[PDB]
Amino acid sequence: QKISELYDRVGFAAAGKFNEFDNLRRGGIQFADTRGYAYDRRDVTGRQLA
Amino acid sequence: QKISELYDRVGFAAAGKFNEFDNLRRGGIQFADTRGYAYDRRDVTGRQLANVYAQTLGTIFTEQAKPYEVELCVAEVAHYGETKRPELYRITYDGSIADEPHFVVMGGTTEPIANALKESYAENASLTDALRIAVAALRALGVASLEVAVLDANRPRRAFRRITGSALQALL
Amino acid sequence: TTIVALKYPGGVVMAGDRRSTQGNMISGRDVRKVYITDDYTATGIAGTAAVAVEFARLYAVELEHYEKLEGVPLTFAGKINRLAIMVRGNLAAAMQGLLALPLLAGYDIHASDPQSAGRIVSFDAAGGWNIEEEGYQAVGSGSLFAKSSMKKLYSQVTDGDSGLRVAVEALYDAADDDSATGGPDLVRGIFPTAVIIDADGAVDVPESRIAELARAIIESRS
Amino acid sequence: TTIVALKYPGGVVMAGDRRSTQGNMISGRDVRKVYITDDYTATGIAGTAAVAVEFARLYAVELEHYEKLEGVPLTFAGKINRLAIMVRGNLAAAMQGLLALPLLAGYDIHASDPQSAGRIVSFDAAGGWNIEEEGYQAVGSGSLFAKSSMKKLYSQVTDGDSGLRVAVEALYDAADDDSATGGPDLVRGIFPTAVIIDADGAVDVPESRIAELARAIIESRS
Amino acid sequence: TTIVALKYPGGVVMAGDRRSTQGNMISGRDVRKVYITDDYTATGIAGTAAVAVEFARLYAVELEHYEKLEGVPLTFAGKINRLAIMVRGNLAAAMQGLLALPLLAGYDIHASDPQSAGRIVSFDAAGGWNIEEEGYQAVGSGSLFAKSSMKKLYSQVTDGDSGLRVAVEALYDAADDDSATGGPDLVRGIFPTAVIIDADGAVDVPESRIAELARAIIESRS
Amino acid sequence: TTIVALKYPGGVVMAGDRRSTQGNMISGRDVRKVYITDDYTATGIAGTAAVAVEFARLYAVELEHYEKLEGVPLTFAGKINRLAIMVRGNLAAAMQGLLALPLLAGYDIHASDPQSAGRIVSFDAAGGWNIEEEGYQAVGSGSLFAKSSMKKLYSQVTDGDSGLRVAVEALYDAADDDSATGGPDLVRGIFPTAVIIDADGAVDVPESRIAELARAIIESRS
Amino acid sequence: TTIVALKYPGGVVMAGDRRSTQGNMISGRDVRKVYITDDYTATGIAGTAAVAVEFARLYAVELEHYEKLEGVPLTFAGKINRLAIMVRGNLAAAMQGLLALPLLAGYDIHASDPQSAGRIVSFDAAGGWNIEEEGYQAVGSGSLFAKSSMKKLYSQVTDGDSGLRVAVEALYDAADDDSATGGPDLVRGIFPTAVIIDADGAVDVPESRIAELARAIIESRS
Amino acid sequence: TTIVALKYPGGVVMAGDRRSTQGNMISGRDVRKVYITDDYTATGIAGTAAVAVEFARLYAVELEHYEKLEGVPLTFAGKINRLAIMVRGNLAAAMQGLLALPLLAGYDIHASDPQSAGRIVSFDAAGGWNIEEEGYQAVGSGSLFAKSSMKKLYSQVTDGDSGLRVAVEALYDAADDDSATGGPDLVRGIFPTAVIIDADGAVDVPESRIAELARAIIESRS
């Protein structure tokens, strides 16, 4: 797949080499969860992730 | 050997340099057991394993000296008492992964075997017919020097099962 | 504290009282002890309030995290395991006094018979767990009175609503015989909280229904 | 020590006494225990004086730091969380005697109804927090007398000024029944400190207003 | 051990189990724990077996001794007092582990209404006593389960026989949830012992009646 | 708890009771304590329930893991060794109270004589092991009563079925003289669990057979 | 040490081993632990050797003293009581390590049925006593093995001689499984001692009979 | 436990009993305590069974490992040293109770006189060692009785067989005066184990020879 949920209201699409864009997908998922746990869900924004 | 059990319903075949493909075999066995212990047996899938090899291969090639002259095929069947189509994935030396609906051919000259299979393949062929088709397309041989195994979907837990010796001779 | 959970044909119900104390002193009149950790599991936690709310929060996060990574929820078995590992992790602090015990109610979508897909699971301080099969469970200081009440009242459970009434009554008897468990406060209008899980997921029982059941019980005893 | 906080229609008020002791010995006659941590929150801290002033300072720094990095203040929920994490961090030293408990008053700009956007939050030594909903809170050695005073006086609270008078009176009764809490010193002219937060932010009540209220109370009791 | 006692219209009934343990080891399968201390009082004793049998014996001796000297039995109040003084006397040894708690059932001949002349009295380790007025009492390791059973079953008590059946059932549930209390042994034919007191004095229930009641309960639960 | 194991001509049998306690309180009426770790070995574990189930699970994983890597199961000697090393590893926690002792039954396919290829192995808390050669073994709180029963009953063992009956009887006497071991519950229909290993592998005895044997014993003793 | 006692139709038999140890060291190969305290009672004592021999001596003196003063022996009940009071008197020293436990066998001449006038009585360290009614008893470090042996062998007891053989065998199994109990020494010719009591009083079994029984058992086991 | 070793003209002999206890309880009737660590050394180990078997195994491994790497066995001096270093390494655990003491018998092929190339070496818990020169040694709970027996019997030693008989007798006296040491079991046919080392290496004495010697001793003492 090339389209993915990142956080509650933040989505993600990519084009290129699957293993790499897929890897970024995972890294992005990772950052949001930890950030939300530390502060809160409504604090993670599409801007910070971008 | 070039065919191996990986997990309950996940099998593995390879072609290339034995020490390397053999090494991947071991790495794959390793990952599944730990994952199962942490979560459970039915959580390890052929897909996750197919993915791990590709990423590892790509990173390894980029940072290592010589690329692994290997070609991998990860196979998965459904569990006991469930219906689902067999899944075949082919992982190439660079990290590329391809989803195959019917058959995978690895190593040597793949064109003639792939074409012979293209004409002879039949879905829901029995074990004997699929063996005849596979040996025939492979010839494009003798009872000796053949490594044959199945992922028998009917087994309760461990699906992988080798077919060797006299029984194999009788079948062929 | 006291949290009861009971299966009924076709689902599971889980209710908890509202009091929180420090010694003999009543410190919280409206704590919520039963959370909806996911679309098919609710979790009650008895014990130290901090450790309790933290457990609930973190477990919900972990269930949903694996769900987002793998594209499919864990089986009920995996969920049981992760909760057990958390509980086992708090053991050192539980010996120091920060003990928190969870009671986990879920509805297995993968079970064979829908009428008995309900699931109740209980844990000790050492992380071991047990799948309850006599139809009900409870945790907290009032748990013994609640269980001894449900043992007698349980033949009356035939659906979602009767099961809910039995839950509320069991809580009423827990509170009636133990001072650390709060009963329905008719003056301030604070009633136990309840969660119902069936084939369609987990929903919070709206307060009015619990209010009516509690008033029916209270008038029955007068 | 004693720090009271109470909501009034449209805002919140927070007042604290001035004494600081060592055993039976009166060591500080003019300590300020209520800080304006930001444009919409004030923080009182009871307990060890060092740990208290440090908490207040560091928390203010952290709120404002995130505000400068992200270009927007945290929600009231995030603020509550960070304060709670600090408090939980001091737990080891609190068992060794260096305990400091904060009471956090804020005005939520994002709340739906402005007349009830006031917020009072209380913490224990273990970092757990509770959003007060009976309209008032207090902390310190005189807290019980202060709360029992406000329970009776609270129906008189109708605006910012009446709420301020009720705060000062509650402090007066705390001091009246506990020796570690200082009352209004008419001789030296030292009165409790107060902070008012409403839609327009947080401002310190100027001393004269507190002086007049205190003199009114003192003459009422004679 | 577990000894229940309940009033019924016109009398009192008192029943006790038969097991005696040392740790996890079952050492006595037929101990008798309920004595007829006199024509209108029976006494059960839970706790250390030696101290128990001694209490019962000595108390019976003292009641009858005063009766022979003065030509008239003590009032129920005097009996209560003497038992209490004995219990208070064993307190030093009870702290050393030799604790024995008595439950005293009697039928007051001097009471005004014969239908409520039944009497149940409970003691703590410190000699204080309490006249039970909710209709039933129990003592021993299974006492909580027995009381929680009788609370529900007690509306069925209407005469001597129904009261006896309720007693036996309460014992059955005590044993069902506690391992130190023995249930009816159908193999060896050993059943709880029971004493009935009414206007005509105290008589031991003959074993056959208890056997039939126990078999009825056991078949009801299958 | 009590787990017996005995060799019979041509195989081995291993049975275990079902109770699990906390102090005097019966907490589990249907625990399974005997696992089939592999096609030729079953493992019983007495002691702390958590540590027990964990041992069994992890050992099964390790046996099968080496089998998958090397393409051939370990010899019975290697299996004995790995189990011993696990047990030795839990020693620190066993001194802290989390003790778990395994009894390992296996059928050696490589032994010379098939009629005596059965194997019983016992372990202490310090990881030392011993190959039993008097034909039977047991572990748990009832082990002494079980062994003293099998010493007399063992001349009756002549095949798989007689060996099974002797196992069930030994369990019955363990439970008869110890309260921590549960006997056959005729009311709820819960019977000991049993595993039989012979030349063809390990199979669980289906419940009906154990039910009939237990009823035969119980009627024999009446 | 180990002392068994069993009733047979028409009488009672009481046998005891001969070893006395200090730690692992065998210090006495021919101690006599069973005394004839009077014409109808024999007394065995396990435990500290000094306290044991003293108990036996003093008790015999007291029985006979009352007999000389009153012209008639006490009833079996009185004897039981005096022995119990002695045992209760040694309790302070038994906590200090000087524990001695007696097992009392007697033949009641006043009983109604001569065939069941045999009597066995057991005591604990706290002076409480119990009249055994399952036909046999034992005391000492080997008592559990001896009782578990007699439970199986007891259906063979039909007269004085078969009862004697069963006694000797029970001792043999005690010694077989415990190292503090001596078995028949064939080399030095030292065998257990035995006393038989029936309608005609108490007599010591002459050594030859015990020698033959022991040799029969030993050849049976080879 | 007890392990004796004595030189005879032309060789060395080393024998050990078979019992293993836990407290007063006989737990193993056929343990082998004397190993052939290599073609010219045998090692006995007294003490904790686990630590003992482990020592023996690991030491044998190390001797043979150096032999494979260097193509020549260590001298008897090097062997002594390595064993000593192992023993010194277990010292921390020996203070905690896991003590194991080795007695090492060897035949030096490099010695000058073949008739006195026998070697006996004893160790303490602290790793120090001593080359025995009065002709014999022993270790274990019975060691003192064994040595005091060999001091008198040693003038009879003239060859391999007489030396073997003296060894067996010394063991017999150890067992005769200590209860932790097992003697020849004539009933089960279990006899001490023995190893003989001379110019041709180390061989186990076959059981029949030890059986005959033991029967000769036993008949001599009757």
Q: Is H192 within 8 Å of H32 (Cβ atoms)? A: no
Residue that is written with structure tokens 């995130």 in the block:
D66
- Rounded Cα distance between B70 and D125, Å, is 61
- C-alpha distances (whole Å) from B94 to each of A1, B22, B90, B121 are 20, 17, 12, 29
CATH topology of domain B1-172: Glutamine Phosphoribosylpyrophosphate, subunit 1, domain 1 (3.60.20)
CA distance F53 to chain G (A): 32
G176 CA to centre of own chain: 19
Pairing mode, strands E11-16 and D129-131 = unpaired
Q: Mapping DSSP to helix (H, G, I), strand (E, B) and coil, where does residue C42 land? A: strand
- C-alpha distances (whole Å) from B154 to each of B126, B138, B150, B157, B161 are 13, 26, 11, 9, 11
- Rounded Cα distance between A2 and B127, Å, is 38
Q: Is E131 within 8 Å of E105 (Cβ atoms)? A: no
Find the length of chain G. 222
- Rounded Cα distance between E43 and H204, Å, is 74
Q: Of all helices (H) and strands (E), which one includes residue G216?
A: helix G207-221
Number of independent structural domains in chain F:
1
Neighbours of G169 (CB within 10 A): 22
Closest by Cβ to G126, choosing from E28, E30, E50: E50
Please choose, from the candidates D3, D20, D15, the residue with its C-alpha nearest in 3D space to the C-alpha of residue D205.
D15
- Rounded Cα distance between H146 and E185, Å, is 57
Half-sphere exposure of residue B104: CA atoms within 13 angstroms, side-chain side: 23
- Contacts of residue B67, defined as CB under 8 A and 6 or more positions apart, other chains included, come to B61, B93, B94
- Rounded Cα distance between F112 and F115, Å, is 9
Chain C residues touching residue A5 (CB < 8 angstroms):
68
DSSP class of residue B77? Answer: -
Instruction: Please provide the DSSP assignment of D102-170 as one string.
Output: EEEEEE-SS-S-GGG-EEEEEE-TTS-EEE--SSEEEESTTHHHHHHHHHHHGGG--SHHHHHHHHHHH
Chain G residues touching residue F148 (CB < 8 angstroms):
145, 148-149, 177
- Rounded Cα distance between G108 and G76, Å, is 6
- Rounded Cα distance between G80 and G90, Å, is 16
- DSSP β-bridge partners for residue B152: none
Give the gyration radius of chain E's Cα atoms.
Answer: 17
Spell out the long-range contacts of C114-118 with Cβ–Cβ below 8 A and sequence spacing 24 or more. Answer: C114/C10, C114/C199, C115/C9, C115/C10, C116/C7, C116/C9, C117/C199, C118/C7, C118/C8, C118/C10, C118/C11, C118/C12, C118/C197
- Contacts of residue B29, defined as CB under 8 A and 6 or more positions apart, other chains included, come to B4, B6, F68, F69
Residue E16 is which amino acid? G
Burial G19-41 (b: 16+ CB within 10 A, else e): bbbeebebeeeebebbbbbbebb
Please answer yes or no on whether C50 and D126 come within 8 Å at the CB atom. Answer: yes
Strands, E, within F50-205: which ranges?
100-107, 118-123, 129-131, 136-139, 193-198, 201-204
Chain H residues touching residue F126 (CB < 8 angstroms):
48, 50, 98
CATH number, domain of C210, equals: 3.60.20.10
Instruction: Please provide the DSSP assignment of H79-105 as one string.
Output: HHHHHHHHHHHTHHHHHTT--EEEEEE
Q: Is A41 within 8 Å of A7 (Cβ atoms)? A: yes
Q: Is E17 within 8 Å of E2 (Cβ atoms)? A: yes
- Rounded Cα distance between D56 and E166, Å, is 65
H160-177 and H143-153 are packed helices; what angle lies between their axes, rounded to 10 degrees?
140
- Rounded Cα distance between B153 and B83, Å, is 9
- Rounded Cα distance between H74 and H78, Å, is 6
- Inform me whether the C-beta atom of residue C73 falls under 8 Å from chain B C-beta atoms: no
- Rounded Cα distance between B166 and B156, Å, is 25
DSSP class of residue H190? Answer: B
- Rounded Cα distance between H116 and C90, Å, is 67
Please answer yes or no on whether H50 and F128 come within 8 Å at the CB atom. Answer: yes
- Rounded Cα distance between D215 and H166, Å, is 110
- Contacts of residue D173, defined as CB under 8 A and 6 or more positions apart, other chains included, come to D145, D146, D148, D149
Q: Of all helices (H) and strands (E), which one includes residue B56?
A: helix B46-63
A4 CA to centre of own chain: 8
- Rounded Cα distance between B154 and B79, Å, is 8
Find the length of chain H. 222
Please choose, from the candidates E189, E206, E146, the residue with its C-alpha nearest in 3D space to the C-alpha of residue E171.
E146
3-state secondary structure C86-134: HHHHCHHHHHCCCCEEEEEEEECCCCCCHHHCEEEEEECCCCCEEECCC
Chain D residues touching residue C93 (CB < 8 angstroms):
none
Spell out the long-range contacts of C187-190 with Cβ–Cβ below 8 A and sequence spacing 24 or more. Answer: C188/C29, C190/C18, C190/C29, C190/C30
Please answer yes or no on whether A23 and B58 come within 8 Å at the CB atom. Answer: no
Please choose, from the candidates E154, E151, E202, E169, the residue with its C-alpha nearest in 3D space to the C-alpha of residue E11.
E202
Chain C residues touching residue D133 (CB < 8 angstroms):
30
Please choose, from the candidates D118, D43, D116, D115, the residue with its C-alpha nearest in 3D space to the C-alpha of residue D86.
D43
Burial F120-149 (b: 16+ CB within 10 A, else e): bbbbbebbbbbebeebbbbbbbbbbbbbbb
- Rounded Cα distance between D222 and H65, Å, is 100
- Structural domain including C181 reads 1-222
Q: Mapping DSSP to helix (H, G, I), strand (E, B) and coil, where does residue H203 land? A: strand
Cβ-Cβ pairs closer than 8 A, C with E, add up to 9
- Rounded Cα distance between F88 and C204, Å, is 50
Interface of E with C in 143-182 (CB under 8 A): 144-145, 148-149, 152
Q: Is C191 within 8 Å of C211 (Cβ atoms)? A: yes
DSSP class of residue H154? Answer: G
Q: Mapping DSSP to helix (H, G, I), strand (E, B) and coil, where does residue E35 land? A: strand
Give the gyration radius of chain A's Cα atoms.
Answer: 11
Residue that is written with structure tokens 């989803």 in the block:
B99
Q: Which residue of E has its CA nearest to F181?
A: E24
- Rounded Cα distance between C135 and C138, Å, is 11
Please answer yes or no on whether H25 and G179 come within 8 Å at the CB atom. Answer: yes
Q: Of all helices (H) and strands (E), which one includes residue E6?
A: strand E3-8
- Rounded Cα distance between F56 and F36, Å, is 9
What would the two tokens of residue A5 be?
């949920």
Q: What region, left, alpha or beta, does residue C135 occupy, with left being phi > 0 and alpha being psi -120 to 50 degrees?
A: left
- Rounded Cα distance between F121 and B51, Å, is 44
- Contacts of residue H57, defined as CB under 8 A and 6 or more positions apart, other chains included, come to none
Backbone φ, ψ for residue F143 (5° rounding): -60, -35
- In chain B, which residues are last before a break of more than 2.5 Å from C to the next N? 140
Q: Which residue of B has its CA nearest to A21?
A: B55
Please choose, from the candidates E138, E177, E179, E161, the residue with its C-alpha nearest in 3D space to the C-alpha of residue E216.
E161
- Rounded Cα distance between G54 and G195, Å, is 19
- Rounded Cα distance between E18 and E49, Å, is 12
CA angle D112, D113, D118 (to 5 degrees): 100
Q: Of all helices (H) and strands (E), which one includes residue F161?
A: helix F160-177
Half-sphere exposure of residue E104: CA atoms within 13 angstroms, side-chain side: 31
- Inform me whether the C-beta atom of residue G95 falls under 8 Å from chain E C-beta atoms: no
Sign (positive/negative) of CA torsion H8, H9, H12, H13?
A: negative
Resolution (A): 4.2
Cβ-Cβ pairs closer than 8 A, C with F, add up to 10
- C-alpha distances (whole Å) from D61 to each of A35, A48, D68, D82, H156 are 20, 22, 10, 12, 95
Q: What region, left, alpha or beta, does residue G181 occupy, with left being phi > 0 and alpha being psi -120 to 50 degrees?
A: beta
D149 burial level (CB within 10 Å; 0-12, 13-18, 19+): buried
Strands, E, within chain C: which ranges?
3-8, 11-16, 20-22, 25-28, 34-38, 41-47, 100-107, 118-123, 129-131, 136-139, 193-198, 201-204
**% helix, strand, coil for chain E, step of 5:** 40, 30, 30
Residue that is written with structure tokens 């034919």 in the block:
E189
Q: Which residue of C has its CA nearest to D129?
A: C50
- Inform me whether the C-beta atom of residue C69 falls under 8 Å from chain A C-beta atoms: yes
- Rounded Cα distance between E171 and E165, Å, is 10
Sign (positive/negative) of CA torsion H86, H92, H93, H94?
A: positive
H47 burial level (CB within 10 Å; 0-12, 13-18, 19+): buried
Backbone φ, ψ for residue H216 (5° rounding): -60, -45
Q: Mapping DSSP to helix (H, G, I), strand (E, B) and coil, where does residue B163 land? A: coil
Q: Is H107 within 8 Å of H114 (Cβ atoms)? A: no
What would the two tokens of residue H60 be?
């044998």
Backbone φ, ψ for residue D100 (5° rounding): -140, 125
Please answer yes or no on whether H28 and F130 come within 8 Å at the CB atom. Answer: yes
Q: Is H1 within 8 Å of H155 (Cβ atoms)? A: no
CA distance H50 to chain F (A): 5
Please choose, from the candidates G180, G23, G175, F126, the residue with its C-alpha nearest in 3D space to the C-alpha of residue H141.
G23
Please answer yes or no on whether E179 and F24 come within 8 Å at the CB atom. Answer: yes
- Inform me whether the C-beta atom of residue E30 falls under 8 Å from chain G C-beta atoms: yes
- Rounded Cα distance between E76 and E107, Å, is 8
- DSSP β-bridge partners for residue G195: G14, G204
- C-alpha distances (whole Å) from C5 to each of B142, C51, C146, C152, C197 are 67, 21, 10, 15, 11
H and B adjacent (3 or more CB pairs under 8 angstroms): no
C188 CA to centre of own chain: 23
Q: What is the largest CA-CA distance in chain F?
A: 55
For the beta sheet containing D118-123, the strands, ordered from the edge strand earlier in sequence to the opposite edge, are D34-38, D41-47, D100-107, D118-123, D129-131
Catalytic residue among D1, D2, D43, D48: D1
CA distance G93 to chain H (A): 24
- Rounded Cα distance between G163 and G161, Å, is 5
Instruction: Please provide the DSSP assignment of F99-131 as one string.
Output: -EEEEEEEE-SS-S-GGG-EEEEEE-TTS-EEE
Half-sphere exposure of residue D87: CA atoms within 13 angstroms, side-chain side: 25
- Rounded Cα distance between H198 and H9, Å, is 10
Neighbours of H58 (CB within 10 A): 11
Q: Is C180 within 8 Å of C21 (Cβ atoms)? A: yes
Give the gyration radius of chain D's Cα atoms.
Answer: 17
- Rounded Cα distance between B157 and F36, Å, is 15
Residue that is written with structure tokens 């009033």 in the block:
E7
Q: Mapping DSSP to helix (H, G, I), strand (E, B) and coil, where does residue E52 land? A: helix
- Rounded Cα distance between D208 and H172, Å, is 105
- Inform me whether the C-beta atom of residue F201 falls under 8 Å from chain H C-beta atoms: no
Neighbours of G210 (CB within 10 A): 21
CA angle E52, E57, E61 (to 5 degrees): 145
F168 burial level (CB within 10 Å; 0-12, 13-18, 19+): buried
Helices (H) and strands (E) in chain C, counts: 6, 12
E and C adjacent (3 or more CB pairs under 8 angstroms): yes
- DSSP β-bridge partners for residue E197: E12, E202
- Inform me whether the C-beta atom of residue H141 falls under 8 Å from chain G C-beta atoms: yes
- Residue G2: active-site member: no
Q: What is the largest CA-CA distance in chain G?
A: 55
Question: What are the residue ranges spanned by the domains of chain B?
Answer: 1-172
- C-alpha distances (whole Å) from B71 to each of B92, C68, H133 are 5, 31, 72
What would the two tokens of residue G210 be?
């015990």
G31 CA to centre of own chain: 13
Closest by Cβ to F178, choosing from E25, E177, E222: E25
Mutation site, F68, F69, F70, F72, interface B, largest B CB count within 10 A:
F68
- Rounded Cα distance between G221 and E25, Å, is 31
Q: Mapping DSSP to helix (H, G, I), strand (E, B) and coil, where does residue G39 land? A: coil
For the beta sheet containing D11-16, the strands, ordered from the edge strand earlier in sequence to the opposite edge, are D136-139, D3-8, D11-16, D193-198, D201-204
Burial D155-172 (b: 16+ CB within 10 A, else e): eebeebeebbbbbbbbbb
CA distance C143 to chain D (A): 25
Q: Mapping DSSP to helix (H, G, I), strand (E, B) and coil, where does residue F15 land? A: strand
- Rounded Cα distance between H222 and H211, Å, is 17
